[PDB]
Design a protein around this ligand. Structure first.
Ligand code: CU
Ligand code: CU1
Ligand code: CU1
Ligand code: ZN
Ligand code: ZN
Lengths: 155, 155
């Protein structure tokens, strides 16, 4: 199937920067997210669909905060819990973590088996966090992803 | 229900070395492989089920070659080509690539959606390659995984 999402590193003060794409296709097992990203920090990063079609910042306690315009994790079924990509009572936007190599690149595709159709993700955003993802709300909320590092709107 | 696989770095000269475990569980979307590994080279590593329940080496053209006793990629449906974990006409043993972090550890779980029950993978081996996996036989065979670096028998 295919949606090419342009992703930018978020910096409300100094300016957002292009870091590449995430291409979304359909497989017989769910949606596949194929990154082609550069310039990110080495490690595993939380990777989720967020509810709003926006990567804009929003104030939080008077601080203009990167990516908050995207809202929370996409949760149309009201799971109200962060979890695993293969967990039915987790947010539907919970994707497998994104791998960024030592050289700052990400090319490894990942499968979201609960997302079945491309139209399901249109009108939302894809977020890449500074932290990782332990697929739980303990010991940190939302898998420990923390701040929003990079984002793209899915059209 | 689960299977705990003991994994070792393959060294036909001075003996295999313990590097941790891979735990296989069932989800509603297929088998989940949760690593708990250490001492490995950083990066993405090809990760596949091989046909024989053996991690022993075999001589191939005068050289005692690591992990060759495991045979080829597990392919009970005779796909006869290497591909994606979500591709039906790929080897059934084709798993998502494993992520080893800078510190040599791997703990990020991956899903094999075409694998449905624990019993189906007993009596095979799980292989970790030195190279990665682009999920094609192009431009390199078997995703570019190359030599066999670590292995466990699924019992
Ligand atoms: Cu590194
Ligand atoms: Cu997120
Ligand atoms: Cu392999
Ligand atoms: Zn979530
Ligand atoms: Zn294969």
């Amino acid at each position: 199937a295919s949606i090419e999402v342009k992703v930018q590193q978020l910096d409300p003060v100094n300016g957002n920067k292009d870091v590449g794409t995430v291409t979304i296709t359909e497989s017989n097992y769910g949606l596949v997210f194929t990154p082609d990203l550069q310039g990110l920090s080495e490690g595993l990063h939380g990777f989720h669909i967020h509810e709003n079609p926006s990567c804009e910042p929003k104030e939080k306690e008077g601080k203009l905060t990167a990516g908050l315009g995207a809202g929370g994790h996409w949760d149309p079924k009201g799971a109200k819990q962060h979890g695993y990509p293969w967990q039915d009572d987790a947010h539907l936007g919970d994707l497998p973590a994104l791998t960024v190599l030592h050289d700052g690149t990400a090319t490894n595709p990942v499968l979201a088996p609960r997302l079945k159709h491309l139209d399901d993700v249109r009108g939302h955003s894809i977020m890449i966090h500074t932290g990782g993802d332990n697929h739980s709300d303990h010991p940190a909320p939302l898998g420990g992803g923390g701040p929003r590092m990079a984002c793209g709107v899915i059209k």
